[PDB]
């Protein structure tokens, strides 16, 4: 969740508190996460340290 | 892709037209802890980094034999320079990189070499300057020369204020040629970095 | 962005705070954390500006009393070039692996 | 690190290239779900108001951020300070319905009314911009709303995006700088 | 017990030296965390106020005690009696932000507002005194604050140090005595 | 024989009337490699050595409360000083030794203490100056005081040109007493040495 | 804790109630505690009781 910090469980059922998401088949569909993790980090060429 | 990237301390330099590095006279350093320093020498890693110095303008009128030299160490305004004023004795080697960037449509060839114990050379002697650690720069092939040399000399440690062991020299082997599409002239620059800097004999304050 | 026959050598340096004014010379800047690179097959060159400060964090905003930039400057120099007159160098910026922002704020005038 | 810039392939160098140590970072505050999860004020109001997140201010943290995404999704929470009773109606309802009490109607209780509402549009997701040549029989489709509310008078309206999902990021701009170097402004300091 | 006073090495003798029994003691009330954990009033106020624990009164139990330490750390709780809504902003924010509602804004509810706030400075710890030759481009760095608050009017401000940590103790003075022997004062007694 | 000989780099100091060393606030140093320096800090051991500074003349007329202080770091003309001009940020601790040499026939007592974040002290506050790391010097017992303190402050690293964390302070606790056989007055000197010197952020040349 | 005496567990999560302290490696770093415990208690010299 984001910006919610109640230790105690909710008093109303989930199907009332929120809308129910449906699927036709959350997942690791985070294009941008993948994208950023795929960035070249190394060094192209030969090194002389 | 003859892509080389050199690092010295917190400074790096990368070329996309290298022809390798030439090691001169040795591939290691002699023992930096000899009797003449008793146990008082120390290594100052903060000095092992690149500094810059302009060499000259490679122009069509400079003929074969035209020579520019730079005796090392030279005037330094960083920690290396401070070292020279704070310690009676020092020693270090050099990692040299020289750029003569014009373009592929230029012609000519420069000889860059590191010479131990310089002495003005007779023009006939120039034909044998290749006996010294060297590398060439020819526009059709490369824009950078890179040479790495160790400290040497009759004394294990030196007093740079009185003697300069190494001296960089760049010389015209074949004059620069230009065309309508080439660079009109080529400025030659040096990117140098002292290696294995060691000092001994703390001098007093000037106050 | 230059032509195949345009050649150049650049240098970028991070001038930490403490000096009165950024050096206009590669020679002076050379004493700072810096990197040089030349033109070639590869068009892009990336460099990381380090986070070096007394406090662990820094303000994203600048106070009006702030004379000299609190975190220093970045200087881009041109060591040389051959027939590279009028050619261009595109520069962009992105977050690094450890870049971090904290403390949300709604500051714009509404 | 040199690369073939033209390919547009991401390149993230690190300070290790010249002897540094990359550190640890904690990006909780830049988490989309979290950041969009706060109340934001809706400025234009009227006795009958159709909830549209785009009425949000374009430079506000939520508004700016929302606009920096092409498509979004979320549930919603609202806070309304109104006179009389408040009636809400789902996306797709005839305006006339707002007068009827059997639609979710909250009886006036001071100082205001806080509610939890579900995403109620007919699309799988909504958009902040919609390149319709027409979209009919900067205008966004009528269907892009969260329903409507009505009361004798509506004094304040705060909206809160719950479970936000953002897609296809687009430009996010800072204040333009006229000053030679930086945008300087008075930052809080003790007196 | 004789010792070499000059060395400054601690020496704690006990009544056993001359036949006594050292007793049991319970120092809960002198525990730093506990003692600093109560509300203290901030006297200077204004519609826009930057929270700075140093505005605390120098002879108050908390103020005096705080000042008897060079460096400190803590979270905070505040109680504010204000007109209109109260908006808080974290350390480092442009004063202008205080006008915006998406920053933590507490809507007026009588009689006052009690909040829990986190340490929000950029330093590992703060100081009560800072020997800056400058510290620029008895003045303490601007960064030494807990954020700021604003409301139409701010009538009272109570501050409470949570999780306090004190370091490097410095002078703590009592009322100076002019009287020949002791400072005498009226102590409560039944009538 | 309370014979102590301290060494810092190539410098030593030995006393034959020590009363030990007082460690202040800590016995170790906090982590010198924090996030705020990324990995760019380095240690410069060549700065860890003794330098000298005159404090004042302990004379019979200076009463209880007379106080002399020296904010650290102070003007340095050696490598430490150069560091301060070559790096944006530094940190180090201090190994302090103070001499008030007269003779066994003198009397009086000085309080020497290292204080974090100085602020001119009210005369009543002087009675509690012992809450700071300290030591005493009394002719009948010792001629040297020695205190060792760690780096500290709200920032893991500092800009000494803008803030001075530690400040040495010597104060008359009981006035000097002289007789026919005692020294007429006592000059008080300080022998200080920075510890665990670390720098970060190489500044440019001034040229 | 100091001056807090609620038997019941907090309703809000810890990461909201307080700021999260981080480390780079509370401990027995109590200079003054150590200092006080190290005080000489005995008697210097010979005793004749």
UniProtKB/Swiss-Prot annotation, chains A, G:
Primary role: Lies on the inner surface of the capsid shell. After binding to the host receptor, the capsid undergoes conformational changes. Capsid protein VP4 is released, capsid protein VP1 N-terminus is externalized, and together, they shape a pore in the host membrane through which the viral genome is translocated into the host cell cytoplasm. After genome has been released, the channel shrinks.
Modification after translation (UniProt): Myristoylation is required during RNA encapsidation and formation of the mature virus particle.
Name of the protein: Capsid protein VP4
């Amino acid at each position: 969740s984001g910006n919610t910090g109640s230790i105690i469980n909710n008093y109303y059922m989930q199907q009332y508190q929120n809308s129910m998401s449906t699927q036709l088949g959350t997942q690791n569909n985070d294009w941008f996460s993948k994208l950023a993790s795929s960035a070249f980090t190394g060094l192209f060429g030969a090194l002389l340290a | 892709d003859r892509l080389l990237t050199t690092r010295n301390g917190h400074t790096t330099s990368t070329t996309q037209s290298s022809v390798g590095v030439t090691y001169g006279y040795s591939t290691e350093e002699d023992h930096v802890a000899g009797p003449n320093t008793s146990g008082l020498e120390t290594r100052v890693v903060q000095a092992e980094r690149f500094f810059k110095k302009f060499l000259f303008d490679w122009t069509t009128d400079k003929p074969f034999g035209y020579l520019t030299k730079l005796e090392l160490p030279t005037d330094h305004h960083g920690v290396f320079g401070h070292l020279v004023d704070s310690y009676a004795y020092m020693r270090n080697g050099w990692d040299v990189e020289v750029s003569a960037v014009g373009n592929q449509f230029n012609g000519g060839c420069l000889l860059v070499a590191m010479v131990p114990e310089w002495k003005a050379f007779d023009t006939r002697e120039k034909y044998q300057l290749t006996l010294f650690p060297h590398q060439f720069i020819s526009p059709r092939t490369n824009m950078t020369a890179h040479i790495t040399v160790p400290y040497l000399g009759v004394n294990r440690y030196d007093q740079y204020k009185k003697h300069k062991p190494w001296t960089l020299v760049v010389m015209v082997l074949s004059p620069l040629t230009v065309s309508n599409t080439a660079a009109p002239q080529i400025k030659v620059y040096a990117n140098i970095a002292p290696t294995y800097v060691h000092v001994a004999g703390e001098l007093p304050s000037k106050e | 962005t230059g032509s195949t026959d345009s050649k150049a050598r650049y240098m970028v340096a991070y001038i930490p705070p403490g000096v009165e004014t950024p050096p206009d010379t590669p020679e002076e800047a050379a004493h700072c954390i810096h990197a040089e690179w030349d033109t070639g097959l590869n068009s892009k060159f990336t460099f990381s500006i380090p986070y070096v400060s007394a406090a662990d964090y820094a303000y994203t905003a600048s106070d009006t009393a702030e004379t000299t930039n609190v975190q220093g400057w970045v200087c881009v120099y041109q060591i040389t070039h051959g027939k590279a007159e009028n050619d261009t160098l595109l520069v962009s910026a992105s977050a690094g692996k450890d870049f971090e922002l904290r403390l949300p704020i709604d500051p714009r005038t509404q | 690190t040199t690369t073939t810039g033209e390919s547009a392939d991401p390149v993230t160098t690190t300070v290790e290239n010249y002897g540094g140590d990359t550190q640890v970072q904690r990006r909780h505050h830049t988490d989309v779900g979290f950041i969009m999860d706060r109340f934001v004020k809706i400025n234009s109001l009227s006795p009958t108001h159709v909830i549209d997140l785009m009425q949000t201010h374009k430079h506000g943290i939520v508004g700016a951020l929302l606009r920096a995404a092409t498509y979004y999704f979320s549930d919603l929470e609202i806070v309304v300070r109104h006179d009389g009773n408040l009636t809400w109606v789902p996306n797709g309802a005839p305006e006339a319905a707002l007068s009827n009490t059997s639609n979710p109607t909250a009886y006036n209780k001071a100082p205001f009314t806080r509610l939890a509402l579900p995403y109620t549009a007919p699309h799988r997701v909504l958009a902040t911009v919609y390149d319709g040549t027409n979209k009919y029989s900067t205008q966004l489709p009528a269907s892009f709303n969260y329903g409507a509310i009505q009361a004798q008078a509506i004094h304040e309206l705060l909206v809160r995006m719950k479970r936000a999902e953002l897609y296809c990021p687009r430009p996010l701009l800072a204040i333009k700088v006229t000053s030679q170097d930086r945008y300087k402004q008075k930052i809080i300091a003790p007196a």
